[PDB]
Structure formats: C-alpha cells, structure tokens
Symmetry: D2
C-alpha cells in the first residue's frame, strides 16, 4: 500500500507514518503466533551469534537435530516418521514428488483444482488456483493429472453433503477408469482444507474414499499442511479434522518458524529412504523450536478453536443483516467469507469483495480476498479478543458501507 | 562428517567437544564473509526485533526495498535491471527458466553437463553433476538439453586453448544442427566457472563464441553465479573474468546472505516485466545488506584476488615437489586440486584425495572432495593469512604422508 | 477363437474351414463400404499395374491429386480445405496436434475420457479408455488435459439433456478456470460420437457450448471422423449431426480406402500451411470407395436402416429387459447391458455370452468396455441379413436369460 | 519438383507426358524390388480379390502368419524372435520406444543426431535430421537424449579409425558420466548406416563398444533398418556388416511391401512377449521372394562395389566430390567447395540435381550437399552405366559452370 511497512507485534502492524493496522491475512499463514514474539526473537538472535549457516549434508548442528525429533513426534499419527528439511513449502512440495516417485517406482501425480502447493517447477505444476496462472512458462513438469475439489457452496438442486462426496469421488475415479492407471500413480497431493481456493474443506465421507483408493492401489497419500497446519484449524493439523488419517507424506513450510525460510517434509520411515541424498538452517531451526513452544504454551491450538467457533457465530449473525455474505466457511480462526450478487444465483461479487478490502484498510484493519469474491480470514492466533472485535466491527460497518453504497475507488 | 557443530566464526569451526578447524570448505561457498560476522549478527538480531516476515505484495518493507535496489546497481553491466527474490540457488534457477521462456515465447532450455543448478524440478533438471538427481524421480523438466562443458586438462594430444574452445563450441552447435531449433531455445544457462564439475573455467574464446551465438539467434545468455560470484573469483562476479559480457539473467543464492536462505534472480529490465513465499524476508535482506557492506568495507574482492593468487603459487610450488597434484586451476580464493595417479595418463586418484581430506580433518582443517579426486578449495574470503598459511601447511604434509602410504582407513 | 479368415465379400467373413459369418465388426469403422467390393478391388488391381508407391514428397501422381481435391470439397463447410495424407488414424491425430501447435503457437491439447484417437505416442496421450494401452510406457506427450465426455445414460436422478450439457461443460471449463490457460490451448480434440467407448453422443447444447468456447478463446476445434464418418452416422460426417459446426481440423482413417492403410487430415486452408511440408494403390482404392458411398447411396441407407433397426433394437428391450439402453444414430449404435434398469450396473458377463452365442450362430460381434455390444455392420448390408442377424441377437437375449449359454 | 507421374517399372519411371526417367532416389529406398515387379503386382491382384482389410485387433488371417514366420527367421541372429506390425516405419519405432519401456521398466531413450526414425511424435523426438526438424510442434516426447553420431569425414588433423571410435564413444558416455542414469535408459536406438544423415556408417569398434555398453547395462540395443534393410547394403540387414550383433529390437519398413504401407518390429522373443494388412502382407510375401529368388542381397553387393569404384575414379578428376561413401548400391557422394576445408557445397549439389533431371535420371540431395545414390537393386547394369555417365558429365558441366536456377 502507498505508505510502506516498519515494524509489527502480535496483531498490530506499524508502517513508516506510525499507522496502526489490525492484521487478518497473516502472510498466507506464517504469523500463526504473531510477529516479533519475544521468545522467537530471542531464539533468532541468540542462534545468529553461535552459527548462521551449515548444511544437514556434511555436518549436524543441534537445534535442527532437536527440531527433527520434535517434528516426527508432533506429526499426525503413530507410525515412525522422519523429516526432511527445506527452505519453503514450495520446495517441500517438490520433494513430496521426489519421494512418492522414488518409494513407489512410479510416475504420475494426482494434485488438485483450487489448490496451491507452490512455485518451483514441480509445485507450480501441482497447483491450479485462479490468479496462479502458469502462462508463458510451460511446458510444465510432465505426468501430472488434476482432479476437482469438493465444492460445497455451489451445487446441483437438492444435493446432500453425502451426495457431494459421491459426485466428486466419481469425478476423481474418472481418469482411473480411462487413461491413468492406478498402479502407475505415485501420489495424491491433497490440501486437507484448501488455502488459495477459498478456505474450502473436503467432506470426510470424500477424504476417506480418497484415503481408501490411495491405500487400495498402493498410491502414496500425501497432505499439504503449509497453510492449514500448526493449530490454524483448531486441531494441530488440518488432517486431524478427519478421523484416523495417517499421511504417507506431509509438507509444511511458511508458518513453521514465524516466516523464516524453513520447511519440512514429514512422512514414513520406509518412504523417506528410497533416495538417500543429495538427490535445515540453524536460525530458522531455532525460530521453529521457539514457535513450536509458543503453540504449546499459550494453548494456541485451542485459541485457534475457541476464537474459531466464536468468529463463526459472529459471521453467521452478520450474514443475516447483510445478505451479500454468500457463505461462511470457518474452521478455527480460518474463515472463507464470500460475497454474492444474490443468494439464489450465488454469482461472485469481486466488485463487493474489493470495496470491503478498501474500507477495511482505510479504517484500521488489513485483510484480502481469494479467487475474486471470498475474503480470506486468517488472523494471527494471538490476536487479543479485544483487537479481533475491532476487526469485526470494521468488517461490519464496511458491509453496511458497500450496502448503503458508500466507498468508491 | 561424524560430528555436531557447537558454534563458528569467520573461518574457524568449533565442535561440541571443543575442537577447532579451519573451514576450507566454506559450506559450498555460502560463507565468503565467514560465519557470524558482527555486522551480519547485528543485522539479523536488530531486524527480528522489528519484522520477521511479510511477503513483498501486501505491504512492502524497508530492507526488502533497499537490497532490491542495491542488488541491481552492482550486477555486471550498464543496463536497467530488476531483481526478484527467493530462498535457494535452486529456486532462483527455476525462476530463470520461467523469465527466459516468458520473455521469448520460446520453450527449450540449454544447460551444461557437470553443473549443479539446484534440487527443484526446474534447476534439478538442468544440472549434470551427480546421477542421484534423476534416479527414481523421472520424468524431468521437458525441453532441456545438456551440452559438454570445456575441459582444459583432459585434452586430445596437443590442443592449444583455441582447439578446446573451437572443439567444444563445435560439440555445442550440434544439438542446434540436428534436433534443436535455435528459434525455440529461450536460454543457454551456464556457470561461468563450474563448481561440482571441478572448479573448471571455460576459455574466454569459448565464452564469446557462445555469447555471440546467443545474441545472433535471439537466445538469452544466462549465468549461475551461486558458487562463483560475490567476490569469490577475483572480480566481484565470475563473468568479469571475460571481456564485456553482460548476463540477460543471473542467479546468486548462498553467500547473498552470509549463509541465510535468501536468493536473487537479476534479469534485464525487459525480461523481468512479465511476472515478479518466504521470499524477500526482512531478517534475511537485513543479513544480506550487512554482508555486501563487508565485501566493500573489508576490501573482500581485491583481497580475494591477492590471497587467491598467493594460494595458487604455493600449490604451483606444492605441485613441483609432489608428482600427484595433476591440475591446480584457480581464480581468487577459489581453486581445484585434481589429484591423479600419473601426470601423463591423467587418471583419477580418488584414493589419495580421501587420504588427503581425512588426515586434514584429524589435523584441524575441514576440506572436501568433488568428482572423486578433486580438492574443493573455496574457503571464507575473510580468512586471516596466518590460518590460510596453516591450512596450506597441513595439506603439504598430507601429500607427504600418502606418498609414504602412512595413511589408512 | 484364433479365427483365420481366408476370403471375404460384402458383409460376409468366410473362414478357412468354409464357414460363413455376418460381420458387424468394429475395431474402429474399418468396413463402411464393404468387403472386397468389386468397385474397390478393380481400382486397386488396376492401380497396382500402374503404380505401387512413389512418395509424393518427390514426384506427384494422379490418384493422390484427385483424392486431395475430392476430400477437400466433400468435407463439411465452405472454407477452402487442404488435405494432408497419413498412413493410419494414429498419424492423422498426431498431426492435428502438430497442425494446431504450429498454427496457434500454443502447446496444450484438450481431449476426452472414454475416447480413443490412435495408438502412437501423440494420439495415445489423447486417447482414454484402454488402461492396458498406457501401462509401463510413460512418459507420454507433455501438455495434454483430459475432460469427461458427456454421459447421457448414467445421469443424476431424472436430469434433462439441458442439465447434462451444463454439468458436463462446467467440467470442461474447470481446467480452464484453474490451471489450463485457454490462450495457451492449441485445440480440443473430440470424437462427435466416441467410437471405441460405447457409441456415445454429446447433446446438441454441449457441442455449441464447446465450439463457442473454442472459437472465442482462439482454440481450434477438432473432430475425429476416424470411427464416425463416411456415412456411418447417416450423414456423410458425424459433425453434421450437429448444427452449423464446420471443423478447423478433421481426421479420417480405415474405410477411407475400404481398409487399405489411409488416413487424412482435413482442416482449413490457412491452418494447414503452418508447417513446412498418399499411396497410389491406397488412393485408387479410396477414390473408388468414395464413388461407392455416393453411388450405392450409403449415407442415405444408413439413416433409414439405422432408425428402422432402432425401433427393432428397442421392442427387444421391452420383452428382454437386460438391455438398459439403446443407442443408435444411423447404422451406428451401441446396445448396453445391465443388471437392473435402476442400478444400471454393467453386466459384461451376459454380453460376452451373447458374443459367444452369436459367434456360434453365424454372427460375429465384439464388445466395448465389457458390456456394450457395438453395432457397426458394413453399410452395404441387405435386409435379409440385417434381420437374419437381428433375429439371432434376440434369440440370444432369450438364451442368456436362461443360462442356456455356458462357457 | 513440379512433376506428375503415371507409371514406373523396376528402375524406370514415366510422367503423364511421356518423358522416361531413371530411378536413383528410389522412393527413399522403398523400391528395392523395383517398381511394379509382376510377382508383387500379381500378389496384390490375387489377395485384394480375396481380402481388402479386416481388423487385426481381433481375429487372424493367412498372409500375415506366413510373413510373420518368414521375417522371424531371416532376422539377424540365432535367438528366437516375434514380429509386430505397423502401417509405416514411423509407427514401428514408436513401438520400439514402447516395447523397450515395458520390458526394461525404464524411461530414457537415447537416439542419434542426424537420425531419421520418422514423423510421429515418438520417432520425431528420436530423429535428429535438421531438414526434418520439429519447429512449432514441441513439447516433444520426454526423456529422449541425443548423443552424436560418428562422422568419419570431418576429423581433426590425422585421426585413425580407432580415434573416431574412441572419441564418439567418449561422447556417447558423457550423458551417463554426468546427468543420464544408465540404469534408467530403456534403449539405445541406432541406425547402423545413417540414411538421411548422409550415408554414414558407424565404425566397427564404435558399434561393438556400444553393444558392449548396452549389454553391460540391460540397455536394449536397437536398430532401425527402414531404409538400410532388405539387402540395400550388400548383406540382408545392414547390421550384418558388423560382427555378431543381435538386436533386441529391429524396425522394418518401406521396401517391405515394395512401398505399400507396411512396417515391422522384429524383436527377440523374450523382449516382445510380456507387454498387418491382408493385401500389404501378401505384397511383402512376394517382395521377399523377389529379393530371395532374383538374388538381390548379392546383386546389391556386386553392383555396390562396381558403383563404389567408378565413383572413386570420378573423384580422381572431379575434386568437388569430397567424400564417397558406399555400402552396397547405396552411397553418399559428398560435394565440397574445397578438398582440404571440406566446406559443404550445396549450390553445386543443386545444379548437379538440376542437370541430371534435365537428362532423364532422377536423383536428390541429402542435407543439401550429399547426393543420395540408392537405386532399386534390380537396376540392370545398362541403366546403372547410363546414370554413371550422366552423373560423370554433370560434375564437368558444373566444373565448366553452365547449369542455372
């Protein structure tokens, strides 16, 4: 924005002029635990003194070593895990293909519509989000198939939620009853809940079906936790929001260390040993350890859930007074609050979603839209309930603003 | 390396037992400035006080603005440039492919055998050092073609450095005169002096031939300077070892940030204009600024040259007593010590190198090998002479022991 | 049955032991005109006298030249065509991808599920029915996206031809809305009716929705008349079962020369010159087979014979219920067998029994996707045979309803 | 060219006006048996009355079977074989990619620069012929690598045969000693003598040394003789000009059915196992007998060595003929601006081709400075001498400089 950024602590952002802003984008999930958090600043700085950089290849450092343990330990499920480290969720998704393809000796990758696994040649190929248009830069990474994601808002007449999971599971089956063998596809990468596609969840009835087909045909079941991890959902991992799921392979990046360039691939021991190198960094390891501690100490996973239920209840009543709110998809501090021209037609109102970004930003609170009309509500999980209401307030006048036909551009 | 590192500073590494070593490796030249340099340590620690992360698209930031100017000034050439961020050497090289293809509307990439470019599907594919970067993970990025790089030691009886360039240039042109059309190759991509090849420099004549070729046929000329720039070589960058060449694109990762995971694409203003996650990081740019400071303040480039030159003559003297050091190729504090059985046959001595490197470790110097038998000598540029004299002395005796066979596994 | 065929004529495979069979075969279109039609034979025989082969990339020759012009006028639309000569269906469909990639400047190709466009590395990618065919041969041609063909049988609880087209065109756009760029998409290949996947036709709305999307976004609109052309559907071309749709590209094989290895790519003048660029005998066979379809009026014959046979194939369904669905457009149908018309679950068991019952009673008939018996006799077929083949199949429905048919 | 044809017999061609020409192009060597040989015409005649085409994807027929036991035996090597049929030499190598990939389980195919494997996306990635190249139709089929072919004419001053074999093999490995996992390469497909590349034979040592390598790694060693087969070369297959090499997979085409669309993949049984036209098959049935009975393997060897000699004496006077390659009635005759720089002289190649055709011999250029001497193998000595004089004159009517474009 025209006036550029200075410092920030928890939820308050401060730019060059001293202007105060309430945060809700939280850097596409990273700011899980606020900005400049004292234990994580202390850990950064105290580590930078000891050793800035050495690589997991040739030498061990301690914190990355202490980190690895804590990440196999915290990981979803009980099977013996192992972590590989990366720089970004972007490069950890690449790895998930490398691993998948190695263990299974297989080529094809089934990734999703609506999804955004990243920005390197492999993770850019796996994605398919609105803005995320890989124009001019093809050909992409070969042997990748896409499959639709269970849309819940936009449906045929009289579909139950049981029906969605049947109709989208049918769509998912469709290439495997055609051109894609099953004994050839090495991996299904799924967002348990989609980020960029508009804070969309898949029904459990669906994921289980997908988590069976994967298990029945030997195709690795990988989950992308870069955006929806570390309490964001109200449980510690988005995958846990479903009953009994043990991902073969999982990615996390971004959030892991309050925005320091770190990432992990957490999967099964036998999967993690089909390559062996060269087919980690200390300060962000130290930061990771510091954020992990904060997640556990401040009851943050719970704060994610308790504030998460509350905010749902605030967007529900607020939808009642402003019929433009077409859907509200909250699971944790984790909203998908999407605007529509009419509630019958459910047509996007990207016009109305951008105006609300303008009112928000101009009246002391920062938020953004995903694919056009859905506002992504992903605030830092240490937002004092106070600050949150002042966000909700402004988000509310802004609704009425655009309703009464107030702010222009 | 059978170890855990406690702490480090400059060109010394301290293990947890308390032992010290000269870091002759410099951790794949991520450390030209050394470990934990004061100005970097206070760059990291002060900026973490203020901002840990926010991507340069919602609010932009103070050092994310500064380094993004300060990077473009200092590139090789006169011509307007913009610079895009990332984290790794790898992920910047993905971006090269991208910027190249986009600009041109073309499809193919040309890369060299024996170069490492990274471990993301893009960069991973262009490489040609170790075979594990394909194995079990195919297919690789489409439309990529590996040519040979010039070797100036393993020559056919009596080739003058002209014959090397012209024979390798001829072996260069062959894909274009067979299956590959010059009008769909977006870019050559080439490390000015290879790393994992064996610190191997292409002749001037080879470079201008390839360079003109690129401009004649609309192919962009790209350089990987991850290993070889930032004072490494003798001049600030490795291209300035050649008469007026100007990169269309250029990458650096690694030593951009005294070890931190930040990285830069530097394209010619035109190439960059088509498009533009932990990338840009405020702590990291802070770190990176400080280390350019030091390259200037501490005279690191002019020093790199002189210490480099000195380090070359002691090996040239060390070659003379010792029959085994086949090639000593070196530019700045940056050389390769390819040991061989006999100096006529020119046949790899993988054994003698390991023997050299092991003994060195159990004598207070950490050096490592490449392509079997080549001693990778790329220390921190800040190295004090006394230590530079000490590593040098240790390695001299290493040579003496092997010739006696006084070394064993 | 390791069935060794010695000689043939019209709609009569006769083997080596002296047996007589009623063809209605398949493995894609092949026998539109008929077996060893005196017209065709004579032309090959006498063309053989003159010329075996001299590749047109050197000298030119008369039959090729007549059949370049012949096909260029007689292929649907107004726009000047030019026509490029492949050896088989495969190397016409491989060339659509060339032809579209060269003209548009765009890499991506959009093709259908349950389709089959050819067996070489280009077209095999495009295809999508035979899982067999795409095992242990990766990687295939890069940039190719698959979109589900319209299924008018297995609907959702009482939906309309209008509901289907939307639902199926939504899916068609899902790619374009996520990861595929419409402006980097060279073309969509589409069989106007899927051959090797159960004789299945897009509703009218779906074709105009796609065609309209194609043209607006700069994507060429490809048709495949490999299986479905040459008066099979009852019009000269399957695309002419739809309204004012002139292809940008069009592939034909098989019966182009009654069987003699010939295929054509027939697009627009401009499109066909994008690249920097046909057997004498095969072309004389073809040039005859083209006169036959006009002369014996086999386009007109199919339509009538076909609808007649539709009502015939449909009262069979109200006595014998196992037939879920009767699909027929001209002498071009696919009779589809199920457990129960509420479950619609394939009963491929019953089907391979009818093919065996019928193989024992002088009538060869091979199956699609297990349960779907494909129905593609040679169009020359006389009514006494058609009925002598149609009565049999009915007798079979009786027999497989009994468990009289065992293996 | 701008010319329409009407009839041809054996060696001789005739356009619709009546100007008689002589074949040397020979339909890119699809006409080995000669044009409209009676046994072949009588074969298509007979069988087209019997069956045009019924679909092979299902049940069987007799001409195919007879051919598929015939070919199967006349293959090179003593190991058991199985054949697979296509419509063209292009789709046949498309199978060679496929088959290799099923058997081995590996992706990477390795093909040679200057290679002509054909024109579908499979054998057009394999291919490496410049004037046959694949602009605006990329992306091409992944995991195809192009190692360079031994050119035994452009050498660096004073290299033995052995040297070229050492060096091009040292090029061969450079992929594998760097980015290409040898244990993940499905097959090396090679033309033994490169057709469209310029009539270029691989040295004895180099072929062995690849066969060796390939054998050492489970890399299926493959051969395309779409061009160079059926006795074009003086031996039956062109491979038998080498020492005890058994192909894992071979590709036959073109002159299989005297030009009628017919292809073949002749493989070791073991390789084909675990993964066609009734008229054209009959056509090949006869064309094989004509090769056999009219005794052509040997005629090609005999006329081939007469053709070689005369040409080497043509070079003694005309120093524009910089290289004379020849193996059977099969040769490249490379035109150069200079006996010592060896610069391609296209310009002249153009005019040579212009003269010759003006005087009733057909002949064309390979990479625009190599004349593709490849007549039908039943060209009588008479005609063969008529061309050799009409070519002889051409070189001198360009030495004097008369021919115009």
């Amino acid at each position: 924005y025209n006036l550029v950024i200075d410092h920030a602590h928890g939820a308050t952002l401060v730019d060059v002029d001293g202007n105060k802003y309430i945060d809700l984008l939280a850097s596409a999930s990273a700011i899980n635990v606020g900005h400049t958090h004292e234990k994580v600043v202390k850990a950064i700085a105290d580590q930078a003194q000891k050793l800035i950089h050495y690589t997991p290849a040739y030498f061990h450092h301690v914190p990355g070593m202490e980190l690895s343990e804590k990440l196999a330990k915290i990981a979803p499920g009980n099977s013996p895990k192992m972590v590989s480290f990366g720089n970004s969720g972007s490069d950890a998704n690449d790895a998930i293909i490398k691993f998948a393809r190695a263990y299974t000796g297989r080529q094809y990758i089934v990734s999703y519509m609506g999804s955004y696994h990243g920005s390197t040649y492999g993770s850019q190929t796996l994605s398919g989000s609105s803005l995320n248009m890989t124009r001019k830069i093809g050909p992409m990474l070969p042997s990748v198939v896409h499959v639709p994601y269970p849309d819940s808002y936009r449906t045929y007449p009289g579909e139950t939620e049981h029906d969605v999971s049947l109709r989208y599971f049918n769509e998912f089956k469709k290439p495997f009853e055609s051109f894609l063998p099953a004994d050839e596809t090495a991996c299904v990468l799924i967002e348990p809940i989609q980020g960029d596609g508009g804070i969309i969840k898949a029904p459990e009835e669906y994921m289980q079906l997908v988590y069976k087909f994967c298990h029945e045909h030997g195709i690795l079941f990988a989950i992308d936790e870069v955006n929806q991890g570390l309490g964001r959902t109200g449980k510690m991992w988005a995958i846990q929001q479903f009953k009994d799921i043990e991902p073969d392979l999982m990615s996390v990046g971004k959030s892991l260390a309050s925005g320091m360039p770190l990432s992990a691939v957490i999967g099964k021991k036998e999967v993690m040993q089909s390559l062996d190198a060269p087919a980690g960094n200390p300060v962000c390891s130290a930061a990771s350890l510091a954020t992990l501690d904060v997640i556990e100490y401040e009851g943050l996973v719970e704060k994610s859930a308790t504030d998460g239920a509350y905010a749902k209840q605030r967007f529900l009543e607020m939808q009642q007074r402003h019929p433009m709110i077409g859907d509200v998809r909250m699971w944790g501090l984790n909203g998908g609050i999407e605007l529509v021209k009419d509630p019958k037609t459910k047509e996007p109102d990207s016009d109305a979603a951008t105006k609300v970004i303008y009112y928000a930003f101009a009246h002391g609170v920062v938020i953004i839209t995903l694919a056009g009309n859905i506002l992504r509500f992903q605030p830092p999980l240490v937002i004092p309930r106070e600050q949150l209401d002042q966000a909700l307030q402004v988000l509310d006048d802004a609704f009425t603003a655009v309703e009464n036909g107030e702010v222009t551009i």
